[PDB]
């Protein structure tokens, strides 16, 4: 448990470019109940975004986490210590959630100190030169007509595919 | 697409008790999103629960899929033409949500008008004789401290997981 809560808490999930405050605290809330603990956002529309009054609304049980939640201006900074990081996309099929799952776990078990992070844009997505940064592209193959889904639903079924393989 | 669409058509989601009408509408758009459009009621709190106005806003894109859901007053009535129904929970493990759409995948496939049903209560959940009714129990094994999560995140969960098994 504790040695599991541990594995847990190499993983991180970064929203660049939140807008809207609610979806921050909905993004505390998602992951929380995947077991995972720690948020960053690069370049928020706002200073403070983490606590406005419709961010900790939405957190409501996982205000902890929409606390201790980091703030950067640049995904360079967020990705400093990341060892392997996912771009999170909607757009050759790149690999999908439940590979780079797959691929977390591998990283993770196989490194002392690996991070990984999974990587948002918003839906006004990621720049070219933000994905350049990462490792991997990976997205999730929703309905064609419906694959437009809040940001804070991609993050719910990324962390549950994590925590999916990590268990 | 059309073959593809029609194996879709013969799964189904049954929310027992709804209880608030805008969870009504975020199943909706919940399983739309997954390429879903077969939402059923059974016992909601009021009639026109599907027509009420927080059901129509949270639905928005899916309104569709809300104006056909079929209320009934009973499970027995909504389970008639399944063929194969999982019993929805977050309570010796049963399986897995993971498990039960893999199963899901095979029923469909083996059988020529097999139908398929996620069932779920709300957090207020199924009593021991609707879960009798079912073929079925699986679960969706969130964080312990937070495994109580929305219904309709639960139905996103386990749509995300029929679609992919489906795919």
Same mark, same amino acid.
């Given at each position: 448990?504790?040695?599991?809560? +541990?594995?847990?808490?190499? !993983?991180?999930?970064?929203?660049?470019?939140?807008? $809207?405050?609610?979806?921050? /605290?909905?993004?505390?809330?998602?992951?929380?109940?995947?077991?995972?603990?720690?948020?960053?956002?690069?370049?928020?529309?706002?200073?403070?975004?983490? @606590? %406005?009054?419709?961010?900790?609304?939405?957190?409501? /049980? @996982?205000?902890?986490?929409?606390?201790?939640?980091? !703030? $950067?201006?640049?995904?360079?900074?967020?990705? &400093?210590?990341?060892? =392997?990081?996912? @771009?999170?996309?909607?757009?050759?099929?790149?690999?999908?959630?439940?590979?780079?799952?797959?691929?977390?776990?591998?990283?993770?078990?196989?490194?002392? &100190?690996?991070?990984?992070?999974?990587?948002?844009?918003?839906?006004? /997505?990621?720049?070219?030169? %933000?994905?350049?940064?990462? $490792?991997?592209?990976? $997205?999730?193959?929703?309905?064609?007509?419906?694959?437009?889904?809040?940001?804070? +639903? @991609?993050? +719910?079924?990324?962390?549950?595919? =994590?925590?999916?393989?990590? =268990?």
């Amino acid at each position: 448990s504790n040695a599991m809560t +541990q594995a847990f808490s190499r !993983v991180r999930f970064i929203m660049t470019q939140p807008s $809207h405050p609610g979806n921050v /605290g909905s993004a505390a809330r998602a992951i929380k109940t995947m077991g995972f603990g720690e948020l960053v956002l690069v370049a928020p529309r706002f200073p403070d975004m983490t @606590a %406005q009054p419709e961010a900790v609304a939405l957190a409501s /049980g @996982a205000l902890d986490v929409l606390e201790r939640a980091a !703030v $950067h201006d640049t995904l360079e900074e967020a990705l &400093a210590p990341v060892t =392997l990081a996912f @771009a999170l996309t909607t757009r050759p099929p790149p690999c999908d959630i439940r590979e780079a799952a797959g691929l977390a776990r591998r990283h993770l078990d196989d490194t002392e &100190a690996g991070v990984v992070a999974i990587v948002l844009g918003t839906e006004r /997505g990621l720049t070219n030169a %933000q994905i350049e940064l990462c $490792h991997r592209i990976c $997205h999730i193959p929703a309905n064609p007509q419906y694959s437009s889904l809040n940001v804070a +639903q @991609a993050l +719910q079924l990324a962390a549950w595919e =994590l925590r999916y393989a990590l =268990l």
